[PDB]
Design a protein around this ligand. Structure first.
Ligand SMILES: Nc1ncnc2c1ncn2[C@@H]1O[C@H](COP(=O)(O)OP(=O)(O)OP(=O)(O)O)[C@@H](O)[C@H]1O
Ligand SMILES: Nc1ncnc2c1ncn2[C@@H]1O[C@H](COP(=O)(O)OP(=O)(O)OP(=O)(O)O)[C@@H](O)[C@H]1O
Ligand SMILES: [Mg+2]
Ligand SMILES: [Mg+2]
Ligand SMILES: [Mg+2]
Lengths: 49, 292, 146, 49, 49, 97, 49, 49, 49, 98
């Protein structure tokens, strides 16, 4: 999963519908899930991911 | 038409009706001739000889020995009517008048765009006699850097495409290129190249005689009682443009409505000029006390 | 200037004159150029188009034009109608020289605007009412009445 | 085929060969036919398709 | 929010974006704060008003 | 567009004195700091001047290996800040007093 | 000739995880992985890779 | 011309297709000549030297 | 290669100098070459004292 | 105002004033600033609250020049007739680079 290829995103904001808004460096914005290894302490607007 | 999956040429041929520029002519001739325009009057001769004549006949100009203009630029203070003159060209050619803005040629992506510049001149050539008026240019007459990067490259490509084209379909009249610019101090060569042009007509702010003719034509559509001295008003409004002379007509008439007159009077022009003149430079006062 | 020819074209017709094409408002800031514009909007009752003269000019070249072309076309359909453009000093500001991909874009969007106002292209009954913060920061096309 | 997903474009030009020049919002132009019940009489440049 | 590959509306996301480094920093706490309320006293009364 | 236009100039006579209390309080006891005396010397200085004076009083404290600020540290620090800032001229007029 | 093409980019940032971020001349950013003969000792200011 | 499969120069095409001048106006082998100059007769001869 | 004297100087300068460098470089690439330099009066003037 | 080399050079100065302290805390900077002359510097940089100690760097004194000399001599290999005192007398009114 973690192994290359990897893609740059930047958390544009966090949504409470249990999705995170991520701006891909590529283009398309997408609302996407998080797991147990990710904290919401980590997450703030503008966080590189 | 190309095969996007075989990579062989399917069909050919510009068919070009062509919608993207179709709506841009014909204008079925404007309502503005040289009759509907005042006196200049020598620069009137200059446009007719520069523009209309080579267009029907590169032959008579060739026989003579001379070369017709490369392009014609109209220049002057706004309100002389430069595009007004162009409407006049349009009325006496009895033809084509390609209407497009130089704002639409500079665009943000690529061979929209480039194709569009070539389209406007192909279009002229088939629809001819023509007569492409584009329109007050400063932006095809910008400056390059090499490069500030989004703006410049576009402007540099469309500038070469523009100048090359006009040179090459007029050694001799076939398509007359007409245009205008409002200000010509703000710009760095492009159209101020003398290899690309050679006829710059100064469109002047109107002569003492010119003002009277303008005033005259304006009252023609309007209704008046005869007492209006058109010659006198022209004396007062020296240093103005032709459009101002309309505003004074229209304003004189708004005053007439306030007086409850459905004709215009000499009283109404004196009042309309008085509004405009006054706002410049002071007119009442004083008698004293001490100047008596 | 505006409410009279909208509600009643007739008086102008009887004399044989033409209404205004616009009205210029200036003065010192705070004199109520925009307050008066929200005032007149209740009284025109004719489709008050609100655009802001600072929403124009992008990094894109030609995109500014697109926007002026679209408001005037909408106004023809709605006509009589008011196009109130809040700033004539951001698409109508005064030049010195072309400089280059900023200052130059101002006259590109301004070239689009002339054109539509009533340069060749029919207005219906629009009536662009402009406003500016300073008295002088205007182009000679706009300073000249007409 | 009329089912989604569908890409929006506009008609650029009409040509003499039953086809309409179509400039999609993505980028590239295509020379393609209309339908049976969609005509080039109905279609116009600036007609959103 | 739209569907993965068929694209079709499945949710709604809040109307207005994007709060990154344009106003998410709502800091009003120490040590630059009301540590000094002893100004320059008069100007402070005016802001409170 | 504002309405409440506030000029915030140099602290008044009383104004500077207040600023010194808050800062001297953080830096412990000093039974010889006369806040008023500090103002007299500092006549007409910004809020951030007063704070740099406070930093440097702490520094003169530890250069004498003291565990608290006394009057002499403030004298040294006021002396440093005001000298740099930007010195009193010495031409009052020969035609005026 | 059959040997592959190699996408040029410029090192966007140095991360201390054994990854390196490279902004690709395609437009996107992608996070990439070092070999066993390109090391941090082969990275310098203005690294075209 | 590069092979689109894996990119490699497979056909060297002619340079810039076709060379472009700038520094306007540019006149390669100007249409004006030295027999086009008359009245400035001895000046023809001096510039030739 | 014609350089006009109205392409010389601005009221803070660099673009005036750049086009002189350009046609000299270009002249170097394209030799035989004749760099016409009209008209010395806007980049050449006596030294105001 | 109305320049471009001495108006826009200020609108990046204004971002700086303003991330050092400002509404933007602290951190652990302590910004060590360095300038040749303060005659073309804005007074906002100059006042304290950020730039608390305004440290002038002088021209080295008599003893000052000697210390500098020996730093430079240490790397050289020297003669024992070398007398710094005389040299520092002659070179009065000089910076360390000289
Ligand atoms: N000589 C004239 N006869 C009749 N009307 C005139 C005359 N001169 C000016 N006008 C009137 O003034 C207006 C023409 O000036 P306008 O500002 O539209 O144009 P222009 O010289 O092409 O300028 P710009 O530089 O703004 O593009 C029209 O309404 C026209 O009727
Ligand atoms: N004649 C008036 N009488 C009462 N208050 C007015 C009047 N005209 C304007 N104002 C007040 O002044 C305020 C600010 O000016 P206004 O909003 O009218 O802006 P403006 O002149 O278009 O300015 P800017 O240059 O900032 O764009 C209004 O919100 C209103 O309080
Ligand atoms: Mg015009
Ligand atoms: Mg306002
Ligand atoms: Mg601050």
């Amino acid at each position: 999963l973690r192994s290359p290829p990897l893609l740059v995103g930047v958390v544009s904001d966090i949504l409470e519908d249990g999705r995170v808004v991520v701006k891909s460096s590529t283009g398309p914005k997408f609302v996407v899930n998080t797991s147990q290894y990710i904290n919401e302490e980590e997450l703030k607007p503008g966080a590189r991911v | 038409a190309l095969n996007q999956q075989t990579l062989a040429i399917v069909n050919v041929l510009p068919t070009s009706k062509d919608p993207m520029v179709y709506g841009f002519e014909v204008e079925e001739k404007p309502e503005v001739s040289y009759e509907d325009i005042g006196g200049l009057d020598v620069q009137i001769e200059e446009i007719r000889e520069a523009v209309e004549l080579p267009l029907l006949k590169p032959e008579l100009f060739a026989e003579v020995g001379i070369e017709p203009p490369k392009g014609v630029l109209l220049y002057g203070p706004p309100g002389t009517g430069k595009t007004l003159l162009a409407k006049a060209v349009a009325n006496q050619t009895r033809a084509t008048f390609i209407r497009v803005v130089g704002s639409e040629f500079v665009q943000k992506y690529i061979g929209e765009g480039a194709r569009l510049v070539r389209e406007v001149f192909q279009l002229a050539k088939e629809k001819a006699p023509s007569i492409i008026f584009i329109d007050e240019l400063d932006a095809i007459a910008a400056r390059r850097t090499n490069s500030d990067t989004s703006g410049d490259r576009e402007v540099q490509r469309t500038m070469m495409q523009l100048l090359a084209e006009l040179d090459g379909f007029d050694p001799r009249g076939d398509v007359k290129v007409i245009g205008a610019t409002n200000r010509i101090d703000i710009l760095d060569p492009a159209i101020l190249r003398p290899g690309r042009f050679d006829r710059i007509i100064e469109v002047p702010l109107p002569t003492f005689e010119g003002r009277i003719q303008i005033f005259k034509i304006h009252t023609r559509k309007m209704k008046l009682a005869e007492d209006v001295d058109f010659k006198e008003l022209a004396r007062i409004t020296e240093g103005a443009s032709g459009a101002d002379i309309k505003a004074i007509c229209t304003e004189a008439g708004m005053f007439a409505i306030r007086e409850e007159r459905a004709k215009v009077t000499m009283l109404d022009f004196t009042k309309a000029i008085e509004k405009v003149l006054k706002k410049t430079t002071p007119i009442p006062d004083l008698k004293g006390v001490m100047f008596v």
